[PDB]
């Protein structure tokens, strides 16, 4: 299976978005437009490319094999600070100032806006199965959406509040599953924190000596790749209240601060993104970097992705096109039969239907 | 050559009747027709005469299944012209049967070859629906069956005939045979899709009409052959409405969610206590519970077509699931077993499309209400009677409850996982050493599934049994059946993980 | 009342023959007759004409399975008394089976009650079974259906005309029809039963076996036109009656020839298309050579059914077979054979379920290489007529098989087969989420996931599994347009989740 | 329900006696000759097999009968110890240093496994019954696989020689592949071991010899009976090499021989040299009830009473077969594997209706 990197900067002088192979560093996909805002550039439906625009109010789209954006564009009353969809591809949700936006894909409707942040929200994440959504602010508050709950609703009301951390919250990730799931939470403060879905409790805190910009885990959840403020990538070992400095942990090389951290599906290479406008690949065992491009500008946006079928055909067409989402607060538009995909009758499913004809024929004839 | 040999044999041998059939079947089973020649010439020889046609029609089948894609693309055109042919012969209905079944197989097959599929739909598919609409009325299942097949690979072609091809469909959805019923139902909801963007807002408006007459025909009904008649049609038109809903489409539709919804309540809100005993009114009552089966399989359908985009609703459909269990609640069975394990499956089918999202067992009225409906149809209770009675909801009830634990355990309160353990634990060991629903194997395996479910999930305040589940699983691994002792054994792979920890 | 007054509703009706058996359904639905005397009345009326007879059975299947124990006890040897009179007035074959589908459950009941049991057993079956025998031949069928039904509920009572009956179902064991062959032989293996049982059983048993010798011998001859097919069809009989008196539940203990009927297995098995003299009648007995292959098969299934983990010591011969008929039938476009092979398959897995832990298979030695390698091939992705979920039942019979093979015999199975497993397992998951193949079907692809939980489950342990990749396929694979796939894949992800958080240190 | 089941050294009046374990009253009672140590099986849960004390046979019982059968499982040598599969289809005896295996189905002395060079002291199976675990006086723990066994001299799948006195006990977790085994010895020593990778997990040292070792069936516990009368609690869900106030168990004035857990794991069953079986709560580590019998304990378990004990009528399915005393025809009953496989109400409705409609369309 082909692994690919999506980056983006911030000076997109050519291209705003470039799609590579992992182990090769060629260009396989390309987009042009505007620039991509940091946390906020989603991939959706494996169809779009949306990406929350630097400084505006507004998040473009693209279409995995066209270079050039979409006319339709996702209005916000306010600055978009961040963008994320749905890993089942029928929710999007932008951090528009303090408050969340979701939208339906499959109905384009502003669903609901959530404002229970008082600072602006810093990032945003779904969990594995889309069951629940985490949202990080500037007020050092993580808060974590139950999206039943959220769609059910007559304001709504986070499953948990998350106040432990005493800086902004720089990063968020979510691992596999929903309930089940844990999430790894970066703050100014130099702590990384680990959480329960579930119960809402703190499983870990481990404190350094520079603010934190990034935080991911692989998917076994073996290891914990923060990204410091000076360049350093610390690695942090899942098997309370520790603390770091362990040489042998860091990957060096960065010379700014790391914003973006990003593992492969196998967990052995670890993508990262900084702001000395450089994406490098590392070998988690060696801590050594295999490959190190360069861009035109700080890093925005930096992510491992398994490649779609759409990404690999040059001929693709997204199944519905994107429809037009609200700006403002039974219609469902959806392709039928999906649900059924395989069911097809099998050779001795047939062969023994006219075989059973047959004897019915042979039995009154 | 060896399939030459296992060909020229059955030649010879042919060249009887009632071995043909189990020679065809092991002549597919050798995999020699995929030489072939003096086959197709002694199917066509057969073929001509009526008191030889079964002999042809199984050559016929064999030689239209097995065919390699030369010698098909070589026949195609005949084949087809010999089943018409035989069509439009008179013959006994069981050799129409026949030769419609060969007729399903040929038209799928040459659907995927461009040059054949362009001749068949310009020159010949319009005269093969000429043929079925043609047929004896004796014949109606075998024609319904081809113009079903012709529509299936065939639909552009099937316009110029659609409107004769609805009315024969729409002539049968109210039958009486339900094989019949079924049919035309399944014949008149591909209708939308016959013809040369107009097949979504065709879609639309066939099922808008479908809507309607289905409020007014409810609207009847809730007011002696006459209610039968009516019944009789809701039923078609609301299978029709879900084969609409629930099959594959060409183009993206829009799903009037909001009105069906409507459409499923109204009908789920008439209770028994609702219609009056003077006149008409017991023959009313006698019919509602098939009335909400059949609102029953609407949801259904319109959960499989939505899937977790019903997630909006989900406070009406949860609020739906116990108010019919209330309506329908009462070694000898109990009443509305049909309609509780229907609504049990939609409960179970909800978790499914909606992984932890489904919100089911999880703080309210509803939710409560369906924990006690849950738990008191997996619970145990001379004379004339069955050993595993009620054995049908409590199976569907313990697949529910397992589904909902696994998915949504973690968020579910710790008193309701207790209340399960104290239910639970004392049921398996009490099945481990007359008449009880856990007399099934099927019921034992379900509560076995529950126990693990019950494990792998719980909530984060309340540990699962582990030691007395793993007993229980020790002892089920031991029970002489074969479905209940397998799953045992399974299970305590699972356990040993959740024992014996790698991390 | 509320069930007296939709009670009364029907009554009223019928006193709408196409819309009788919904009402029937309708009546069993609200439990109103469980909770009567009239229509009992009307049904003993409409069963006094022809022109009526279907609509009194109509009324009796309900009254007879619904009736409480009161009225059941009161009427039973009336409605008895009522089926044995339709069945001897020359009705059509449809009423005939009507009737005999009534009179079904009103034995099962009648056995449960001692007085009406002996009752019957003494004065009311014997005629039941005379008036079964002496039915048309076009309703043969309906005559042995009441005949097992007889024979399952009062076997004591059946032992006068065991003669009789044995003479009834010998000629039908060699029907071409399958389903009245099939009833032929489920009613001619309870003959032991009726009437010394166990002796009985074990006396049929070996005739049945020394049968099969005989005619195999005959099939295999020179190896070991019209005429074979005839010898074919009274082998695949007994056979069957064979198999259903190993698999068939028996009131007393029995002695269980497992040697014998491996032999005859062994025997049935060992010769293969490179025996046959293509000269002759050599080429039908080429093509007869599969179905007889099958029968040893099912043969083969009856015994680990019947006999479970006490083959244990059997397991050698048993796991050598597999491979062996593997190799025998073994060359968009289906490959041949596939019913044989998912047959061999199925067996594995049933050997797998019955002996656990224990079976021995994937194991070392050629005979488990050979088998590994069989399936394998049997579960890879293809390396125009046809069907695009072209070989999806012998891949899904493969995945099944060794995905049990790897649950319960995992750990003793030897690292570089896991590491062969992990190999291909992993680009095969991933490889299907982003023309012709197997795994088109939605059951192949929920098997192989299955295979892969069964892999993470049960790994060797000198082989860590490969928990990420197969956690990603898993957040792949719910995300599938499918509700198996994707459901089964949140389920195994709940089970990777309690692999990956461990709740003990 | 849990019963208790207990033998002593003399046995005046009763062999064994089963008692209900919260209420104590006397369940079952049974006459006959005395269990050795390490020797009463239960088998298919409806005969009781005792290992005769200084004998070379085997006694039989019926569940709800007092006196023993006149079938005894004679063997060649004194009988040193005696377990029962778990499914009831074979039984292992310790004669000497050799083990001995019967196919309940048949009575056919199958095997005759002559590894050990001293006596064998202990034999347990697990609990899906695919493998067996013999401790002997020489010092070993020999895994031996059931297919293996069955299907061939042949040799156990693992050898463990770390122990360096006499094994005195031997426990299996559930399963076979995936199970765990703890072991006790003279060198006052536990160990716990994986059958599959055949490794040695953890070890305890003590300061006086290890008599007993038990396991909750969870494996959070660890129960070791000593040489003086203290019962060790070992917590193992919280290194490979541990060394042993509040986790003893105090009250025994003799060896602890027997241990046994409850289903749940909050009672804990001790039977020892000075004629007495008691009772302990394993939170409070306190001694819930003290029976007193007429010498010293040798067999004495917690296990969940079987419907044939709680039955007075209830005899065995099929008779004990002859055991054979020197090295086709499987006798058992049929159709138990489709147990429960009865059709449901709402199958046989819709073949009725069925048959209806059919009929119906016909005529």
Redesign the interface.
């Known amino acids: 299976?082909?692994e690919v990197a999506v980056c983006t900067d911030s000076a997109a002088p050519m291209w705003s978005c470039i799609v590579w192979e992992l182990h090769s560093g060629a260009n396989l996909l390309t987009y042009r437009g505007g620039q991509a805002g940091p946390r906020g550039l989603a991939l959706l439906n494996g169809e779009y490319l949306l990406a929350a625009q630097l400084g505006k109010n507004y998040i473009s789209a693209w279409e995995l094999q066209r270079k050039d954006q979409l006319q339709q564009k996702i209005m916000c009353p306010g600055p978009v600070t961040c963008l994320t969809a749905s890993?089942?591809?029928?929710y999007v949700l932008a951090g528009v100032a303090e408050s969340i936006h979701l939208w339906e894909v499959?109905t384009g409707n502003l669903?609901v806006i959530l404002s229970r942040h008082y600072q602006d929200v810093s990032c945003l994440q779904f969990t594995?199965?889309?069951?629940h959504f985490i949202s990080g602010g500037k007020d050092c508050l993580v808060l974590v959406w139950?999206?039943?709950?959220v769609?059910?609703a007559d304001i709504p009301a986070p499953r948990h509040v998350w106040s432990h951390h005493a800086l902004p919250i720089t990063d968020l990730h979510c691992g596999?599953?929903?309930?089940?799931?844990?999430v790894a939470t970066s703050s100014l403060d130099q702590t990384v924190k680990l959480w329960?879905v579930?119960?809402g409790?703190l499983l870990l805190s481990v404190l350094f000596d520079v603010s934190i910009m990034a935080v991911t885990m692989?998917?076994?959840?073996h290891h914990m790749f923060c990204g410091g403020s000076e360049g350093s990538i610390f690695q942090v070992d899942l098997?309370r209240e520790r603390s770091f400095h362990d040489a042998g942990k860091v990957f060096k090389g960065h010379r700014n601060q790391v914003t973006c951290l990003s593992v492969s599906?196998?967990?052995s290479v670890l993508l990262s993104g900084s702001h000395d406008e450089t994406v490098r690949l590392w070998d988690v065992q060696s801590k050594q970097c295999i490959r190190t491009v360069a861009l035109k500008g700080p890093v925005t946006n930096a992510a491992i992705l398994?490649?779609?079928?759409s990404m690999?055909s040059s001929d693709f067409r997204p199944?519905?096109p994107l429809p037009h989402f609200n700006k403002h607060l039974?219609?469902?538009?959806?392709?039928?039969?999906?649900?059924?995909?395989?069911?097809?009758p099998?050779?001795?499913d047939?062969?023994e239907?006219?075989?059973a004809?047959?004897?019915?024929?042979?039995?009154?004839? | 050559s060896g399939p030459r040999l296992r060909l020229l044999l059955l030649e010879s041998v042919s060249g009887s009747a009632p071995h043909l059939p189990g020679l065809m079947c092991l002549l597919r089973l050798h995999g020699s027709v995929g030489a072939l020649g003096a086959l197709v010439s002694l199917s066509n020889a057969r073929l001509s005469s009526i008191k030889t046609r079964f002999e042809g029609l199984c050559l016929l089948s064999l030689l239209v299944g097995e065919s390699p894609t030369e010698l098909f693309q070589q026949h195609c055109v005949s084949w087809l012209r010999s089943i018409q042919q035989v069509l439009q012969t008179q013959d006994p209905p069981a050799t129409m049967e026949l030769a419609v079944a060969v007729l399903r197989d040929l038209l799928r097959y040459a659907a995927q070859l461009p040059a054949l599929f362009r001749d068949i739909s310009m020159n010949h598919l319009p005269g093969l629906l000429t043929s079925l609409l043609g047929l004896r009325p004796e014949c109606e299942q075998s024609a319904l069956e081809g113009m079903k097949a012709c529509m299936t690979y065939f639909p552009r072609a099937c316009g110029s005939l659609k409107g004769k091809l609805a009315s024969f469909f729409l002539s049968r959805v109210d039958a009486l045979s339900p094989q019949l019923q079924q049919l035309a139902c399944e014949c008149y909801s591909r209708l939308p899709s016959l013809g040369a963007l107009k097949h979504t807002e065709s879609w639309e408006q066939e099922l808008h009409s479908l809507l309607a007459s289905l409020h007014t025909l409810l609207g009847a009904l809730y007011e002696a052959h006459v209610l039968l008649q009516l019944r009789q049609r809701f039923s078609g038109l609301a299978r029709c409405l879900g084969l609409m809903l629930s099959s594959e489409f060409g183009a993206p539709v829009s799903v009037p969610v909001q009105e069906i919804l409507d459409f499923i309540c109204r009908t789920l809100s008439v209770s028994s206590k609702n219609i009056s005993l003077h006149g008409d009114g017991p023959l009313r009552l006698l019919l509602l519970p098939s009335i909400h089966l059949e609102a029953l399989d609407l949801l259904s359908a319109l959960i499989l077509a939505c899937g977790s985009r019903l997630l909006r609703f989900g406070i009406l459909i949860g609020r739906l699931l116990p108010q019919v269990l209330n309506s329908w609640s009462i070694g000898q069975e109990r009443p509305y077993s049909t309609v509780r394990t229907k609504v049990y499956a939609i409960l179970e089918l909800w978790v499914q499309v909606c992984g932890a999202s489904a919100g089911m067992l999880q703080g309210g009225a509803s939710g409560e209400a369906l924990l006690t409906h849950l738990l008191s149809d997996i619970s145990p209770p001379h004379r004339k009677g069955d050993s595993n009675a009620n054995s049908d909801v409590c199976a569907a009830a313990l697949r529910g409850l397992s589904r909902t634990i696994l998915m949504c355990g973690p968020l579910i309160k710790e008193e309701t996982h207790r209340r399960l353990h104290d239910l639970v634990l004392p049921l398996v060991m009490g099945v481990q050493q007359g008449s009880s629903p856990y007399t099934s194997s099927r019921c034992r395996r379900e509560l076995y599934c529950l126990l693990l479910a019950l494990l792998l999930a719980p909530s984060p305040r309340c540990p699962p049994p582990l030691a007395c589940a793993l007993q229980a699983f020790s002892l089920g691994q031991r029970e002489d059946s074969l479905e209940v002792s397998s799953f045992c054994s399974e299970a305590l792979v699972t356990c040993a993980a959740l024992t014996h920890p790698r991390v």
Do not use: I, W
């Open positions: 299976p082909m890993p089942n591809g029928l499959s669903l594995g199965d889309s069951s139950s999206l039943c709950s769609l059910q596999f599953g929903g309930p089940l799931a844990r329960e579930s119960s409790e692989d998917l076994a959840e098997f599906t196998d967990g398994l490649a779609p079928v690999l199944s519905l039974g219609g469902l538009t959806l392709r039928l039969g999906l649900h059924q995909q395989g069911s097809e099998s050779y001795l047939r062969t239907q006219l075989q004809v047959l004897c019915s024929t042979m039995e009154k004839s």
